Amino acid sequence: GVIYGAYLPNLEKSVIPIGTASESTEPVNRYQIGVNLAGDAWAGYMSPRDNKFNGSKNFTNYFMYENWVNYVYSFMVTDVYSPWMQIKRISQDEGTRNDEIYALAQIIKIAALHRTTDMFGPIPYSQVGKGSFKVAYDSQESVYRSFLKELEEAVQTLDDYSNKSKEVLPAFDIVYNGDVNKWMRFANSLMLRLAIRVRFADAGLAKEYAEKAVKHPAGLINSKELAAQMGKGAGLQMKNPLKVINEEYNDTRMGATIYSYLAGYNDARAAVYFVKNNGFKAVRCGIAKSGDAYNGFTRPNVHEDDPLYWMKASEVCFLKAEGALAGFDMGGSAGDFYNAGIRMSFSENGLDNSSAETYLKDSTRKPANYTDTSNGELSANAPSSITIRWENGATEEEKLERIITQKYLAIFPNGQEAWTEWRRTGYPRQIVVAENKTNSAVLIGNGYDLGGVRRLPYPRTEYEQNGENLHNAISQYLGGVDNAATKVWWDKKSK
Amino acid sequence: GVIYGAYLPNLEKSVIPIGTASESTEPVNRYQIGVNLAGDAWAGYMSPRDNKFNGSKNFTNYFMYENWVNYVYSFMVTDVYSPWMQIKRISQDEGTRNDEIYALAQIIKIAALHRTTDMFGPIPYSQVGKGSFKVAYDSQESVYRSFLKELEEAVQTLDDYSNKSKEVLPAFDIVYNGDVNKWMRFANSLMLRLAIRVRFADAGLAKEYAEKAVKHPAGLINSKELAAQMGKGAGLQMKNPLKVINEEYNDTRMGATIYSYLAGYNDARAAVYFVKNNGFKAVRCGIAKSGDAYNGFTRPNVHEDDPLYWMKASEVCFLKAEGALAGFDMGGSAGDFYNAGIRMSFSENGLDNSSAETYLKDSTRKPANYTDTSNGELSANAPSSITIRWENGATEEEKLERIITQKYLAIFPNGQEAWTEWRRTGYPRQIVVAENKTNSAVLIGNGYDLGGVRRLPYPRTEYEQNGENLHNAISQYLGGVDNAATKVWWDKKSK
């Protein structure tokens, strides 16, 4: 189906902004603003070399700059829906239906849009594409319930189709070259992520779908060869946007928060994730303009053709570890999946198993204090004292802290997901910002269950062209307060 | 002989509108308005792809559009009586009579006109032919009593004639190529249908003629090869009107009501009646204009030369089942005929007996709930929970429900008969309309014994040229109220 060759790659490139060589740097800018200066900053992975953007008032110090919010909404909504609608029209609304192609597009749409609703809360969803320019907003709750149901339906369609053929649009699928089995595994894995996410809002919904995902006969992403990633596929070569931000823009450095954990635990992944050289030097997030102060500080270790991962195998293990802790039927104890998650992450990073075993038995090392050699006034104490080695007799919160802190280290550099899990659980504990220049009521907080960016505010463009519908969503679902301090539906632990 | 070649085929083509390739699309339009958008809709077999007809105010949402009623009355009355009167004039009212030809013409006339009176109630009948277009109406009761007596006399005439010759106008009869024996079987089978129809209005009349039909030595339609159909005959090839409505007009889709039963029962006839693809997607009747929403939804599975059936063999089994349930001497139990009807329908649809046996022994499957994936507001619960397998200890209503629901699936796509039987018994229980734009006091009702279209109102043409006679019929037989909420004589159970 050559007709789908234009839309499918574009839809996949919209999940996490990325493109080919001819297409690059433009989407790199979307990645820089929507991920590198957003979730990466707020989750403590990375900090700008120099906080100079917009007169030093930007996402990194909690100033929700209007131009950036308009931009992010645009590429997280319009760029996802446009190619999806065209695939839906051709595969479902013209001639003979092609359900397998629609099931594929649905899986990719949810891979993109779960990040969008996690970012903003309520979003246009069920009413999109029904002939109206002004579109009504769905509650985040209904969107998540729909995601879970759509993924299950998508997997069933592909499972029925697997009897007929093992491939769907192979010449145009960058992720798995059309492999139907790998798509079912990703869809099941994504369902598990989204089920765990809703635990605190609705434990019953979480149990239902977490158990469906782990019990489905098609399986889950359980090896690095099955990971959902954008690198080489369909004859194309994606270009890592973080490499461009690092080398060409010289705009990013190692974050103080992730340093505390990596350095404290003497973590062998530190040298894989960042260029160690003589030693690590990290930058604290939410600080004043510093000129050339952090030029010699640690940069991420990333190359031009390094794949960008929607989901790694190690993440599935930590999701099952938490599902086990939650009382769901995951087919194992929380401790066993936790240890397996650590082993998988080391394997994923090219580290040997002996190193992994020694690491997961470590019960003495704790997160390190942060020292800023350029500015001692920015030095901070370790945000946590949690150790690595699993303890069966630990409190439920301590068990959760370990699982999420280790998942956090495994899923690096996916700052969007790291930020979401920090919002949902409070982990890993962050080193709070040094300065707050917010225009959206954001609190410095305690780096755990209070404060930080809880969501992006809605874009001005929605106030200008869809104001009635936006007002209804804000009133119904955000308690009348459209700012970054307001919590989304699944965020039910924080204060 | 040649004299009858002009009138007999025209009379047979007027029973249910259909014609050869040269005279098609005009009769397709009669079939579309008189069956596809009337009985098929109200019985739940099919719904329009897009409800756009007459600014979305038409039969499907209970608006009895004047132009359509005039049209329907014209082809259900004038088109039947014209060729019949000429056959009568030549075969009875001129010198040497020909009783066998008139007998054949009578059977075909009743095949047509029982649908007309079921549609309108009282109609011109006994006073037709003598004086003008100003003809007095007969009560439906008198018309039915006459039908039953006329069929018996017709069969008696053909029986006497069978001793002299086995054929009548073989070169011009499209249905049975002049086979006198096959015509006698159809006459007896039609008598049975009309006998059971009058059960609730007059149980004595029903018993008399139901027993006459099943005891007559000529027999009934007891095999697929004896079915009364319009396809290949007398050297002509009829063209299925549903195929044209489906492919050329793109105007019809699977109904939500029939979906519930076919999908819920995992019915192997579903893929024979409709084009399955990945699965089924049905459309609810009585809804707003939807543009391209249902373009990809399920279409009927039908080809250019597929026969159109006046009566299938399996229906005879379901009529006997009910007759036995009513206490008549049918020569078997209700359960035995019920099961035979299911096996017969499976054979009629080219399915093996192993499928049929597993199906009729199914005591757990229930009709499915209806989900509209394009518009969640149109989703509905299953209208019934009746299961397939016969139960001797069930209530009399449950036994009737089973018989009628299975007859309904067996006689697809005969919407006229399906609608007539729903009005008479309330079965199968329907998914009610979503919107009611009625101009004729029709109630949404409960999909069972309350509401729905109870008849077509009389046409304006009759108010304009036969007003005095029409008024008398309305006053005497319809309680002074000519609308679609008023009931016809045989409709005695409903409220």
mmCIF file of N, CA, C and O in Angstrom, chain A residues 92-93 97 99 130 157 160, chain B residues 277-279 281 295-296 374:
data_model
loop_
_atom_site.group_PDB
_atom_site.id
_atom_site.type_symbol
_atom_site.label_atom_id
_atom_site.label_comp_id
_atom_site.label_asym_id
_atom_site.label_seq_id
_atom_site.Cartn_x
_atom_site.Cartn_y
_atom_site.Cartn_z
ATOM 1 N N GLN A 92 -10.132 2.920 6.949
ATOM 2 C CA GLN A 92 -11.435 2.657 7.577
ATOM 3 C C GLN A 92 -12.648 3.262 6.870
ATOM 4 O O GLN A 92 -13.730 2.693 6.949
ATOM 5 N N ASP A 93 -12.481 4.404 6.192
ATOM 6 C CA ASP A 93 -13.633 5.132 5.604
ATOM 7 C C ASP A 93 -13.696 5.161 4.066
ATOM 8 O O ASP A 93 -14.468 5.932 3.495
ATOM 9 N N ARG A 97 -12.203 -2.057 4.253
ATOM 10 C CA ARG A 97 -11.444 -1.680 5.427
ATOM 11 C C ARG A 97 -10.177 -2.499 5.544
ATOM 12 O O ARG A 97 -10.147 -3.681 5.188
ATOM 13 N N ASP A 99 -8.224 -3.220 8.707
ATOM 14 C CA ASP A 99 -8.165 -3.091 10.153
ATOM 15 C C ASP A 99 -6.794 -3.237 10.750
ATOM 16 O O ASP A 99 -6.512 -2.596 11.756
ATOM 17 N N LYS A 130 -14.577 15.108 13.659
ATOM 18 C CA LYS A 130 -16.030 14.956 13.435
ATOM 19 C C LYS A 130 -16.652 16.179 12.702
ATOM 20 O O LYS A 130 -17.830 16.497 12.884
ATOM 21 N N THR A 157 -7.040 -7.411 16.982
ATOM 22 C CA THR A 157 -7.050 -7.279 15.516
ATOM 23 C C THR A 157 -5.765 -7.821 14.916
ATOM 24 O O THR A 157 -5.800 -8.563 13.939
ATOM 25 N N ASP A 160 -5.552 -11.705 15.287
ATOM 26 C CA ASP A 160 -6.365 -12.360 14.257
ATOM 27 C C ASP A 160 -5.644 -12.282 12.909
ATOM 28 O O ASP A 160 -5.611 -13.257 12.155
ATOM 29 N N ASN B 277 -15.066 -9.311 6.551
ATOM 30 C CA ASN B 277 -13.767 -8.582 6.689
ATOM 31 C C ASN B 277 -13.068 -9.014 8.040
ATOM 32 O O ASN B 277 -12.858 -10.218 8.244
ATOM 33 N N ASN B 278 -12.716 -8.073 8.933
ATOM 34 C CA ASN B 278 -12.078 -8.427 10.239
ATOM 35 C C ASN B 278 -13.145 -8.840 11.200
ATOM 36 O O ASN B 278 -12.962 -9.748 11.998
ATOM 37 N N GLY B 279 -14.251 -8.119 11.155
ATOM 38 C CA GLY B 279 -15.413 -8.415 11.966
ATOM 39 C C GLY B 279 -16.569 -7.565 11.472
ATOM 40 O O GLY B 279 -16.441 -6.848 10.472
ATOM 41 N N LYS B 281 -19.448 -4.473 11.723
ATOM 42 C CA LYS B 281 -19.697 -3.127 12.218
ATOM 43 C C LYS B 281 -21.077 -2.726 11.693
ATOM 44 O O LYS B 281 -21.277 -2.617 10.471
ATOM 45 N N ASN B 295 -19.079 4.735 6.151
ATOM 46 C CA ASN B 295 -18.590 4.255 4.856
ATOM 47 C C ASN B 295 -17.901 2.886 4.939
ATOM 48 O O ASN B 295 -18.118 2.036 4.095
ATOM 49 N N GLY B 296 -17.125 2.668 5.986
ATOM 50 C CA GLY B 296 -16.402 1.417 6.157
ATOM 51 C C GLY B 296 -17.143 0.321 6.869
ATOM 52 O O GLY B 296 -16.625 -0.762 7.016
ATOM 53 N N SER B 374 -18.031 4.866 15.868
ATOM 54 C CA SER B 374 -17.975 6.232 15.323
ATOM 55 C C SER B 374 -18.670 7.232 16.225
ATOM 56 O O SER B 374 -18.325 8.404 16.218
#
